[PDB]
Amino acid sequence: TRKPLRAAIIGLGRLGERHARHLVNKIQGVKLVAACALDSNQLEWAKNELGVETTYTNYKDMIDTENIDAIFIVAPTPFHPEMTIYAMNAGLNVFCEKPLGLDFNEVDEMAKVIKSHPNQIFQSGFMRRYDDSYRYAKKIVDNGDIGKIIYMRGYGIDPISGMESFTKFATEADSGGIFVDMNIHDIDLIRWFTGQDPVQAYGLTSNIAAPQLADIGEFETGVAQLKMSDGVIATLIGGRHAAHGNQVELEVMGSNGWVRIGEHPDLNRVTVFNDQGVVRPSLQSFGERFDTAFTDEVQDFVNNVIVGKQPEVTVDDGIKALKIAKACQQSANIGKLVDIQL
Amino acid sequence: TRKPLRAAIIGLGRLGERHARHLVNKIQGVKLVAACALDSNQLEWAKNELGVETTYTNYKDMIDTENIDAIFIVAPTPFHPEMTIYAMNAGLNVFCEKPLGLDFNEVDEMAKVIKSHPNQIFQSGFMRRYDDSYRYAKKIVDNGDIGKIIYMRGYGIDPISGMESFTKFATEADSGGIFVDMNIHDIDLIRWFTGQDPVQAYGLTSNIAAPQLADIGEFETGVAQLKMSDGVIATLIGGRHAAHGNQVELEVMGSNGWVRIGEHPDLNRVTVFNDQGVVRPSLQSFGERFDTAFTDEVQDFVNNVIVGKQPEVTVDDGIKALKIAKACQQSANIGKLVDIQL
Amino acid sequence: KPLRAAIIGLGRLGERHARHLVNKIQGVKLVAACALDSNQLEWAKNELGVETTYTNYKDMIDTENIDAIFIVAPTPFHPEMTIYAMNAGLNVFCEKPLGLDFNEVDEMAKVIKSHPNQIFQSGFMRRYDDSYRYAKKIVDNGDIGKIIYMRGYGIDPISGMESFTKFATEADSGGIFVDMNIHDIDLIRWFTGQDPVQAYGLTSNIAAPQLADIGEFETGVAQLKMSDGVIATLIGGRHAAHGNQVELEVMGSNGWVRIGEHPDLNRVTVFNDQGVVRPSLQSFGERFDTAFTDEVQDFVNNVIVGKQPEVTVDDGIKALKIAKACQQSANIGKLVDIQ
Amino acid sequence: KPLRAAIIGLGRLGERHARHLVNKIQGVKLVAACALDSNQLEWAKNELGVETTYTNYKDMIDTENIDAIFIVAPTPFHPEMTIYAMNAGLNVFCEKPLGLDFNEVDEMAKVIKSHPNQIFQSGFMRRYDDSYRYAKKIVDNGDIGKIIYMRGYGIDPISGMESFTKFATEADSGGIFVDMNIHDIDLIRWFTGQDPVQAYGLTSNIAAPQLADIGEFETGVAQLKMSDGVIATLIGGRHAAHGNQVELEVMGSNGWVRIGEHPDLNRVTVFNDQGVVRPSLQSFGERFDTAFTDEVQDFVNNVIVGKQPEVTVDDGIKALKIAKACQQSANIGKLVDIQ
Ligand SMILES: NC(=O)c1ccc[n+]([C@@H]2O[C@H](COP(=O)([O-])OP(=O)(O)OC[C@H]3O[C@@H](n4cnc5c(N)ncnc54)[C@H](O)[C@@H]3O)[C@@H](O)[C@H]2O)c1
């Protein structure tokens, strides 16, 4: 029927490889013709196992050489602004993973380049908005079935088994810290659910569970309490040392009923009875938890390019969530309350 | 204020010791004066730990020597009829544990002796009727909150840790088989909930989990299906080899809703997170599960003796439950459907 | 080179299968569609881009250039459609059950057996379900010891009653055991590696007394004796208030597993005046959607690679004979010995 | 030989303590009762068999032959009722909290210390609860590793709003943190062995704007920095739809425990048009009935043997200070340092 979109991908790591698989196997109206990474094994895997034509170690070279309509940026956070700016100037439609970046000026310039190319689609990586459970809860809230929102609590905690791959991820490039890396999703959800902005942050951090993270300037746990512009209160917890699995939980406490999303991170529909009692095995990664969400958001992006429609989640939503996460980290660093400026 | 009832107990085993503890510590308007057991150490325990005045190895000696208003028979099932008859004839009020007996001839004579002493209270031991949860579900059903009952499922499975204490219990005396020992409780519950009687039984037995039980003529598992007098269908499962704990479960499946009682045998209100996932520790015995019900039923008996009122659960209820149980056992042994007449 | 495929039937499950074929399945193109409904065919042509539509399935097989056919028409037509396609060289995916008439199913199996270069696959999708596979891996590893007892539930929500009544008046459903429990029967055989030797069936119409007029039963409860000493219970029903209950309990000598104990819709827990609430799934389609996609993908891959599926025609016959033995037991009011 | 006992207060909790004293507690006789309500006093004399009833507690103490007294009167009377009883050479069980005014509690604590032959026990019943003790056992054994974070919830159902509104118009509750989270603070102090050094509190009246008219807050949320690096959250509330939520999460370095994640009424699972439902507890009393019994039994035992309870007066004072810091933090819109 219609000519499929020609696409390229930067990054083939923890999330990169999942996006690449979906891009080849699951996404309609797209052909992944080029891949870029600094790891030679990942590039060989992209070529031989996935059937991607051309591989690159230089992303600028790829954009300069390849005939592509859209690009997927799944490289580390510090590279996001420069990679996006380069692709936007080349005339490309951009899907960039969260966060937008780390430096405020680098993000602002990125935002300026995006706004100057309105004919090109820019989409961020807040996948939890596409997840069926979060949507279902949002629909309940929008219906008035829990009254007015009083309080929201967000958990985002990786399991102990993920300490090796996170360390590599954080050693090789700045992640922005626990609040920026873990809590940013929850920050967007709170903004989405309430329609309000945080005006004050109290952040506390911890290395009790993993003291060796101090060596690389990381905190194992980040706990933040937020005050919103409308009176709603919030707690955010990011962590890396859960024993059961990947905990991703959102609690929305209303004036007339509550909802809890992902109270237990159940793997499947199987209840196990053993010498421990009654067990529910848990999901061990964010990727297995949000696999469908990752697929649906990317399909949405491809559809956005074809139709010529910008995503509901704006650049400003990415900036605001980043500034808030930074504020929580600032609060912990300085040991003071931080009034959020947006 | 008023003279307490003077009571005695026969048997201080798995259930006897719990009854004796409640009788000294929890039950009001009663004083445990004497105890009878064949175990010397159990009798010493009654004197030294509980403060019981006198001890006996012969129950007839105790009944003919002690000044008592009431007796508690927690001796093995075969001794129930002869102990009840002797105690009834001595003017005593009798609380006898379930079941009434094993031989239909012995139980008939026992029932006749109880009928001939209408001024003396007799009470069986179907404690589940006193349990808070079963009562709650019975109220739900009676209010019509599940519509009309169509199906019921009763599970009564001991944990693997109880295998040693059961073998002791079943080698020293005839327990009456798995359907009589385990499933009798659910039979009573089904009769209670429906107001109907079973007309047909299909029973099947298993020694897969423990083949050594055949050496004492016992079956590890007994599964029975029942046709009720007004349409209802029921399944009963008695077992002795669960890994998680003591499973005691009742499902009432209606035309406009269901209820499940004790779907999981949760020990307490603690949820555990470990390398297994999300865990709920389980109850390990019938005595821990039904501790309150055991207390409440004995208190009801004591009140019944004082006020001069026969309990709701009649002798007829015990006979029928025993008959239906033995019909399930017969069905399994003869490999045929058994039509029940009550 | 993608497979050229046709579909017969665009109903409750037919529309779902056709969607997957177009949107999710790799190595295939849905070239043609056949149904008796004009609206369903227009939906297939407009919304799914199906090139050609037919009311006559035989005319479709004889006109279209196709490699595979998906049979999602009513059960009675399964044998003759499978037979016609097999004799025309096609690869066949046929939905459960194989059929109702034992002779037609034997004739059906004969046509399958005489075309060994052609793939035939049935629709036991629960074997592809992530949860069932997980439990099957647990049992195989010896994590629950030996199986002693299994319990299978298949109960539809009240909302489906008015839908089912209209269908069961005009057509033969095969009965409550055949319709609601055949999946559970296959699962028991799969998990145990053994066959039922005896069956006790009971039926009920307490929840829907109006079904007695159309020779149907609202509830069927069956107790089964396995060849190795394992005991099973099957329940089929049509009057659950909470939603679609599909449950398997596998009781072992050293551990139990339960599959779909509660038919949880998603990961949202609700707190309201009723207490603490988990919303439930309302149809088999929503529950086993991924399974429906995976089995169909498996079939496509089987045709391409030229490999017959694990589940045989014999598996489909046996599960049907077992289900019918349960219905017979209830109807004659007697124990039925199975072989 | 039983201890002769009296009770002051027969309201929401007093009525419960009185019943346990008569029906369940061993080694104690409830001889006298004092309240400002005729109906309550008459209920004590008729349904419980209490000999003498009073409307003045001073008259009761000065007349009755008693060894112990239970103070379940309103909080403003706690300091003066304890001092009056301690001076009378009496063993005192006093409900939470010790008081609302720091000067009155300071004087109260000084009197308690000067009578060391008399037992003083407070009302932190959660330390007697089976579930909290089981979780405390896990934490102590090192079965969750090192504590990193803890979260305490105490939320009353909407049904309880009416009785609270009329009460808080009449008397000072001490604020949402003092009234709803004091148990949780003690629990955190008990589980960690550490003390908070800093508090950030925020309040809300979104659910009940009418409470701002009487200087009350419907919801309070606090974050606490503990002295050795542990982080904690406290939430008190009065507008839950499902029932009484009382929950404690202990997040560790190698495992977590959650106590009372759902406030389950019993062991019954309900299946209806809304899905799978667990009915919830509606009050703190029904949730902690056994805890109330066991602590009062422990007090009686303490008086018999002559052993002071593990929970000290400094525990009740510290917990109160911490809760007040949370309230103050919200009221002034600033962080509060705690010493
Ligand atoms: N949405 C989510 O829940 C989610 C989850 C995980 C990661 N992410 C984001 O996705 C991005 C990638 O995360 P990850 O975990 O896959 O990282 P990773 O460490 O696993 O992999 C990084 C990849 O980027 C490539 N790369 C690094 N520098 C490059 C360079 N300058 N030029 C070209 N390629 C380069 C590497 O070869 C590697 O394949 C991060 O920005 C992260 O914030 C989002």
Ligand SMILES: NC(=O)c1ccc[n+]([C@@H]2O[C@H](COP(=O)([O-])OP(=O)(O)OC[C@H]3O[C@@H](n4cnc5c(N)ncnc54)[C@H](O)[C@@H]3O)[C@@H](O)[C@H]2O)c1
């Ligand atoms: N209500 C229930 O849920 C329930 C549960 C378990 C047992 N029971 C019933 O309780 C009875 C005993 O149960 P148990 O598990 O404690 O058995 P047990 O073997 O543990 O204890 C039996 C006790 O009776 C004493 N005894 C045996 N023969 C005696 C004799 N002839 N004269 C005097 N004393 C004698 C023994 O010394 C022993 O202490 C059984 O009849 C059983 O059916 C009921």
Ligand SMILES: NC(=O)c1ccc[n+]([C@@H]2O[C@H](COP(=O)([O-])OP(=O)(O)OC[C@H]3O[C@@H](n4cnc5c(N)ncnc54)[C@H](O)[C@@H]3O)[C@@H](O)[C@H]2O)c1
């Ligand atoms: N795997 C499962 O759990 C499962 C679930 C539901 C149904 N099924 C099976 O799928 C089949 C269809 O089920 P359904 O619920 O979709 O039925 P349905 O009534 O909803 O749909 C039947 C479809 O077949 C078409 N059709 C009927 N007769 C035809 C004919 N002679 N020629 C061509 N087309 C014809 C109709 O137009 C209709 O579109 C049944 O055989 C059933 O056994 C399996």
Ligand SMILES: NC(=O)c1ccc[n+]([C@@H]2O[C@H](COP(=O)([O-])OP(=O)(O)OC[C@H]3O[C@@H](n4cnc5c(N)ncnc54)[C@H](O)[C@@H]3O)[C@@H](O)[C@H]2O)c1
């Ligand atoms: N342990 C807990 O979790 C918990 C829970 C609720 C209440 N409490 C505490 O218990 C105390 C009472 O609580 P409540 O809810 O039962 O109060 P309430 O209002 O329901 O009852 C007060 C009772 O005290 C009596 N009373 C009032 N003034 C008196 C006076 N000056 N002299 C003699 N009697 C007097 C009244 O007659 C009434 O019976 C409070 O101080 C409260 O802080 C503790």
Ligand SMILES: [Cl-]
């Ligand atoms: Cl938004």
